[PDB]
Design a protein around this ligand. Structure first.
Ligand SMILES: OC[C@@]1(O)OC[C@@H](O)[C@@H](O)[C@@H]1O
Ligand SMILES: OC[C@@]1(O)OC[C@@H](O)[C@@H](O)[C@@H]1O
Ligand SMILES: OC[C@@]1(O)OC[C@@H](O)[C@@H](O)[C@@H]1O
Ligand SMILES: [Cl-]
Lengths: 287, 291, 291, 288, 287, 288
């Protein structure tokens, strides 16, 4: 009975993957605070090696970009040091390791979109911590790992989405007359449900390498808010604003847009589509 | 006898913007002198000062320029002579006869910084010879006619209609009308559009008020040519594919910035001036003149 | 003494620097006009030229400005109107009157280059809208009053307290006096301090001589806000903690450079002009007025 | 009998190396369409591991810089993914792996010349694809690989040279009134025949690490055209032009010039010389 | 007895370490020009493997930053090629390897300070040679190495200190009327004696990873000269000058200051303190 | 009454040639001296020049020691900026046509290989900045009655007065030196002082105005110049290319300060420069 060990299983993407794995023959182990804690990297190696998993899905991370900037030690411990121990454990167990990374490894060059050939050059501590986390993974598990870079993640549905999409929908449904959205920072959206489907396919094929997974289109939060407004027949105003209006601890690049040049050779794989279409399917689940 | 009419002297009177202006001026009290090759030629800057000063215009609208960005990169001498040296003579002539001078400039004075949008407080840093030539032309205007000039920076100009538009919009429309199976449009270079007809209306207002200083005149929105092609496609019920491509598939001589988008922080204080609107609405009105 | 009654017109007369200058001018024989909102308002630049030309002053001290750096980044229209457009009208008025114009500028015109300090030969390259607005204001002043203006760039200003110090130094002193026992101060932002009292002394001297050009006026030393906070603490017998933090801990609207330190290469040839000294000494003198 | 497996064996350099290995005791396998294709990296590992070579010479690559920029997927599949599978196979077999890379891994910094201590920072997709290829070779074959970075390759002679030097000579022998050459893009030349001689030596020594192999000098195509013109007593005009007069899909750096700080250590290795001397020797093969 | 092999044992740091190891149970082998020469990297692997050390302390390097810029071949051979051979030998023997690196791997970005998450981007050939040296250590000794980045090293005392601090003290004692010190290049100081104490602790814990070890504070040579002046009651003038006054072959960044986000988690390890307390203790050893 | 030409830096290398060329004219030439004008005392310039009432001002005096300017920016400022500003204000008052000799050093910060008159100055050091701000002073005060000429690496003096790069290379060759070292990784353009003198005389008579780059065609290194001189003088020793790092200096130097002109061709009858090798050979011929 093939074993899968999952970190961040109660996270948004993790919950989808954990649920999808229930109708399979895998023995799934969802780590908890008492068995695996990113703040205690020294206890990770012994735990994972004793479990002897065949597959490791490493989704746990410190994703508060601003907290990472104020407390780079936390970004480092949680995203770099803990990942290194997981990578060393994976290598010792001979386990295939999936590492969820981020479009934030890019931004420093200042161009509009980055593909798998672009050399990462981060703009903040979150991105740096994820980048060194990737290095740890590909050095320890060279021919047996998969690194997936996601953009701005959308997922959770009405009951669990407390991120951008859920917030914009909340404001519309509460009868707000004007909603402000940043128009001078660009990125790409990644549907968590879609990514989940891809991951299930990747586990079964034991796909390896580095891949960018995001809907096509380089857009702003303002563009996204406007699209949501159209879908819900919003009557108020969506106001485009500059970043300066909402000061934040971490610098954000002009764009963290990502596209893939390698997704198309994955013949049977579940793939993303156009951002508006993928956003519309997700927004539809709010009824 | 009746009083002498105020005189307007226009360069580039048969260009996209110039044609709208010359036409709108027919319904005014102004006497309009539309320069031609036989009176004013940008390639003969040395004859400009004598010609303009003898005409003694009250207003000078300087729209003529070498606007082929790629030609300017291959032949910077042409860019310099046409956009800088000629403009210097026009500004000196404006100063000498006391004329209010309007200089049409470009969002291409920006780009080297690499940000998404620029307002009138941003300091120009061009990316190519066309932009450099326009920027130094601006300096010539400011230095000579300090308290009596208006510099307007326009972005990607749309205008001309079915008969005259052979720029981006006209070409996309021609491909749609020809039933092209697919149209490619660059997705990784951004800018702002400027409706020539709206700019014309603003210019008529500006001449009447003698507004001075530097302004950015463009529709709201920082978009790509791909975004524009998609919007035109929707307006004309195009059923072929509109394909986003990177700038590498269409090699060009002149470097283009990631963005030359422009916005204004000063247009709102001109309470009764005709203003641009949202890019999609302004584009829709223009595309409507084709069908 | 002087057979004619000469006039000084001051903007920002109640500000930190302005209040010292105004008090100092009471001893002189100049007719001093201290503008107020009813006669000159930066938000109404269109009324400035006629007002100043009617006063026909011999000297104009232009200290008024929108100096909230973060507000300027959020509302660049306000920075533009108050610091650029209003200044342009003042400069045109000074030129019309033959008045010597003193313009207070800022170390914030620098920062984009990323080096540790800047002198008068360094070419301004700002990092935010406040800095751009002051720089463009400087251009207005030079292009209008070339052989009859003085631009002084000041760094982080100290002075006027406890009643008028509302800047960085005043805020640290205020927290200590309020009984705070733990004060955070940014260790990754470097700059130079300028004593307002001292700068006032220099200005009185500059008015008399009608000194012209561009000059940096700041105490010697490029230091961090943390270094300054520790120095203030010592001077005030503070026994609590001064905690050094990174700029990420205090998110702000406007980007700030690694350093806006300024030094002067021209102050030393100004023989008997009052000059600044070492930052710690100048800070001590000022704190010595509180105690 | 030691087995050598060569990719790109029918390319210009590959053909020289294949030919030079004929009078050796090696069993040489030159891959073909029926056994290995850069377009199908998914079939490489099984094939190479089944052959169990002792040495792998990886010369095949997508070298059309402009095509790489328009189609980064092709640059990535051919130069990155294929190279990764070749490196994994070499590691599995315990084979010494030679990877031919490029000066184009540099250029982003904008300086005039780069040595082996300079950190690669590419300017275009071709350069990025070669660099990521080098990383695959280093993450898989530590202590058993040789990465050679070549500059502007010259080779082929009057029958096979259709690159810059061949075209200049063609225009000169056709009696053209003028020749235009870009003067504001700099680089270094690498003699293919010299590089081949060095490679034979490296195979025999199983030399390892990263090395820059190019004639000494950072020069423009204009400099090169002018040099060829003197050698052939050309009487037309050689006109220097800016790169802007020839628009291309891929950006090029102000310089991709490379020099070596480690070549002189290899006492007995065949080495390049000065660019003008190396170019004169190559141009001489077109006379007769 | 476990065997410790040391390169650069007669250097500033090497001498403090060599002496501190005499009061321990290790068999210490101090390499010298007859057994290991950085200029002869070809002889290193055979010698180290024959010795079979359990621990390797690699402190030897070409540290003349300006010489490195003029002769990058020397920088490469001594700091990269030799380090590559030492790393391969360490892997072959299963030896824990400690590599002394430098703050000079940073500087190209132009910011005021760098922590362990910052991606190295050197400004000169010395820095590049040290960085490529670090890469060799990581690629070869995956999970069994410690890389310590030090700043401006202070140590040696009255008889051996001929570096920055020593020179300032000499000018003070000679009664110079004025001392010039560069005010526009910043960095961080590292007390050699303290670093020695940390190294002894690291050897015994076999601590691994990459760590920055320097006193707290980003300062200039001028700040340091002023602090020494105060400590020695110097009556002359300490003049802040721009770096142009002292032309040097190697470019120096605006700052090479380093700080650590990981030192704090090492509970019982000997730590550095504030730059003035640490400088004062060292200056105290001159009188 | 004769038209008056007032010259600063008249005893300098370029200034001395212009002064001699003007002896064969109807101009009343006034060469400034310590008793009338000093760059160190800008405060005394305006009263002097306005009392003198020149019709033409040739402003050649400057602090050109680039490294000294970096160590002592106050000197660079006073001499090149403040003095120039006072001269510009005096020219404006007198209605005099003002010639200001500037430098390619106003460029370099961008890091490209060559700069024309449309490129926006962005200097690399204090010397460059001081010259640039001096230029602004000249434009802002004499808009329609000034000429700013930017020269590159100046060559001139001959066997008696040349103690700069060319002169030093020639002394080493005639002395039979074993080797000569020259920097290969810093580029620029050469300007013939004699050709510039001829151009200046033409410009004075035409009262030509604006900004113009005056230099021989070609972006080259000191090493290229040294090698060309060696060929001309049949030198048989070694000419070794070295990196700029072997000669540390106070002022940063750009990868290139090369300048070219896009406006020199429209000045039909003006004396112009030619190719760098031709212009160099002619200069080198004055030493034989
Ligand atoms: O040119 C630098 C480099 O590419 O070559 C030497 C190798 O050891 C690599 O680590 C390094 O990145
Ligand atoms: O044949 C030489 C050359 O300079 O001619 C002009 C262009 O075709 C260039 O690509 C080419 O290298
Ligand atoms: O004589 C020429 C030269 O290359 O010699 C060595 C150094 O003195 C250089 O400054 C100088 O230009
Ligand atoms: Cl168009």
């Amino acid at each position: 009975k093939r074993k899968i060990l999952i970190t961040g299983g109660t996270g948004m993407l993790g919950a989808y993957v954990t649920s999808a794995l229930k109708d399979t023959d895998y023995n799934v182990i969802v780590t908890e605070r008492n068995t695996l804690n990113l703040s205690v990297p020294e206890a990770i190696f012994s735990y994972i090696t004793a479990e002897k998993p065949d597959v490791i899905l490493h989704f746990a991370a410190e994703t508060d970009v601003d907290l990472c900037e104020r407390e780079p030690a936390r970004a480092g411990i949680y995203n770099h040091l803990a990942t290194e121990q997981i990578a060393q454990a994976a290598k010792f167990c001979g386990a295939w390791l999936l590492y969820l990374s981020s479009s934030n490894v890019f931004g420093g060059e200042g161009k509009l979109s980055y593909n798998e050939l672009d050399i990462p050059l981060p703009m903040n501590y979150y991105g740096r911590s994820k980048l060194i986390g990737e290095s740890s993974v590909r050095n320890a598990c060279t021919n047996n790992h998969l690194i997936i870079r996601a953009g701005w993640m959308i997922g959770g549905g009405p009951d669990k989405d407390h991120k951008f999409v859920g917030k914009i929908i909340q404001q519309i449904k509460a009868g707000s007359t004007s909603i402000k959205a940043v128009s001078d920072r660009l990125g790409s959206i990644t549907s968590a449900m879609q990514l989940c489907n891809f991951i299930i396919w990747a586990i079964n094929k034991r796909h390896t390498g580095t891949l960018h997974f995001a809907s096509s289109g380089t857009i702003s939060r303002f563009d996204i808010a406007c699209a949501i407004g159209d879908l819900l027949n919003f009557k108020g105003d969506i106001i485009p604003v500059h970043s300066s209006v909402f000061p934040l601890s971490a610098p954000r690049p002009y764009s963290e847009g990502i596209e893939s040049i390698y997704m198309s050779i994955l013949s049977d794989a579940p793939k993303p589509s156009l951002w508006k279409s993928d956003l519309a399917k997700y927004v539809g689940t709010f009824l």
